[PDB]
Write a protein that binds this ligand. Sequence first.
Ligand code: YKL
Ligand SMILES: OC[C@H]1O[C@H](O[C@H]2[C@H](O)[C@@H](O)[C@@H](O)O[C@@H]2CO)[C@H](O)[C@@H](O)[C@@H]1O
Ligand code: CL
Ligand code: CL
Length: 515
Amino acid sequence: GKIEEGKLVIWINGDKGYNGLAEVGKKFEKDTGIKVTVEHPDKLEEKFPQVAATGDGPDIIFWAHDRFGGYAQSGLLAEITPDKAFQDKLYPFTWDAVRYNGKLIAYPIAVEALSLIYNKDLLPNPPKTWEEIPALDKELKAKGKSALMFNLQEPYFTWPLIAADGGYAFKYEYDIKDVGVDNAGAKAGLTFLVDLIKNKHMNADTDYSIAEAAFNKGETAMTINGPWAWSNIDTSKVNYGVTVLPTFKGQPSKPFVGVLSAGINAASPNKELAKEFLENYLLTDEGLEAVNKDKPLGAVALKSYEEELAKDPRIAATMENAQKGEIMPNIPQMSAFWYAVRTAVINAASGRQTVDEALKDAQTGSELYRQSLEIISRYLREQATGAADTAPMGASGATSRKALETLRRVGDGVQRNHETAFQGMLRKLDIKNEDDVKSLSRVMIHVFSDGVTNWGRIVTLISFGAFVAKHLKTINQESCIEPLAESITDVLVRTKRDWLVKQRGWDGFVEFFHV
Ligand SMILES: COc1nn(C)cc1C(=O)N[S@@]1(=O)=NC(=O)c2ccc3c(c2)N(C[C@@H]2CCO[C@H]2[C@](CN2CCN4CCOC[C@@H]4C2)(OC)/C(F)=C/C[C@H](C)C1)C[C@@]1(CCCc2cc(Cl)ccc21)CO3
Ligand SMILES: OC[C@H]1O[C@H](O[C@H]2[C@H](O)[C@@H](O)[C@@H](O)O[C@@H]2CO)[C@H](O)[C@@H](O)[C@@H]1O
Ligand SMILES: [Cl-]
Ligand SMILES: [Cl-]
């Protein structure tokens, strides 16, 4: 498609102050004559990369900063270049959340962290620990109430508990190879949650709407939610407090902290209008107030307005929880991490998998991109140069090593046996440079991904990749090999994610072709 020139289309999630944002849109229109349309489509964070890839979608996309590195890596976002005067009006750490490969890829809006929200008329003093919640629920059940209800369908809400005793996404000291999804800490956290469900203190089917309705109707004493939820609680007239999340095994719950951010679509012909809107209408005291009055933003990036908002105890509590938590990475692998952990929590909560089974799969899913890249990059580069990479494999190194040696055996068999067809494709594709390499993804998707899924055809995908890498070296295009490896890996892990996790990833590969 093609984005329409001379207006702005904005996407923002359905839990945010989109009516307030439209009010800012109307102010923009009054000055400029430019119509601003605000939409809140379902699953917009999944829809955006799909539609933006074809040159379509909104001019401006709002989401937490974690999704934006993936969008930027895919070429879907315009670089943001505000002047010093504007940059200095927002907190430096908020700009850090929207920096990717040394470039700003969005405007930061507000800092979001989950807090414990409690009904003061049911629980005058909230529990300091997760461990006391079962007993509290038993006490409340005798009054026809429950202790706690929160969204169990999105791992964002369960993550603070998983991370408490030592669960982590990607180690920070980031070591992207070091994933902490199936360690003792993560298992302890998720087992506690599953035990709450087993003991009928929570229901595995509880989602955002169910938890919100139960808290706002006075049926449950506590919920876990962000600043955006406070408006509906205000309307309900529940006498509520916002406080520090309970501890688990004596340690703070560690929410993953988000920075609501606004990115500009790389395909937009309205980039100057978008910049003007965001800098001089939205990111002002009046603009943010308009949004905040609809649904609270949390701790805003704009220093001048945050000085007012920081006096609110609910914002103090938000920032207390934020400081105990961690700012989310914006690495492209966050989407896969979230999908992996989402499935794990849901499956463990429903009883479809045990906690061990669930987190094992989540670990495999979260490691999949980087492990696949290590194997594929190494094979392509050693095939092209004739010499192996001496660098340590790192995390899950036996698997990588054994997958690579398996690939050497089976892949060299494919290349030899199918040399003529490989030569025919190589010449027909006519790959000369980094631009021609960029075009191969669509062809790989059409030929590899649409065909039957098995380890044989995965070996062909990679082996032809090695054949191309050899050619690139020969023609003094050795710099194209790593981009090629990244492209093959993306195609493999994106299109065959679910199948790969079912095989136990590269351990399945090694087993399948064992001599
Ligand atoms: C017991 O059985 C086996 N054990 N083991 C170990 C393997 C098999 C086995 O049977 N495997 S197999 O089923 N595999 C495929 O079909 C297959 C799988 C993945 C592929 C892939 C194919 N692709 C086309 C191939 C390349 C050579 O000619 C292709 C061919 C033959 N076709 C026939 C149709 N014609 C139409 C006109 O243009 C030429 C084209 C050539 O694909 C069917 C082929 F030879 C496959 C041989 C495999 C061994 C069969 C390469 C692609 C698309 C091109 C771009 C591109 C770029 C990179 Cl970097 C990387 C990859 C690619 C995607 O990856
Ligand atoms: O549940 C995984 C999900 O978590 C975060 O999404 C949050 C978002 O940051 C909040 O603004 C609010 O909308 O709640 C969401 C959870 O439903 C991540 O930002 C997101 O990428 C991830 O998929
Ligand atoms: Cl128009
Ligand atoms: Cl899949």
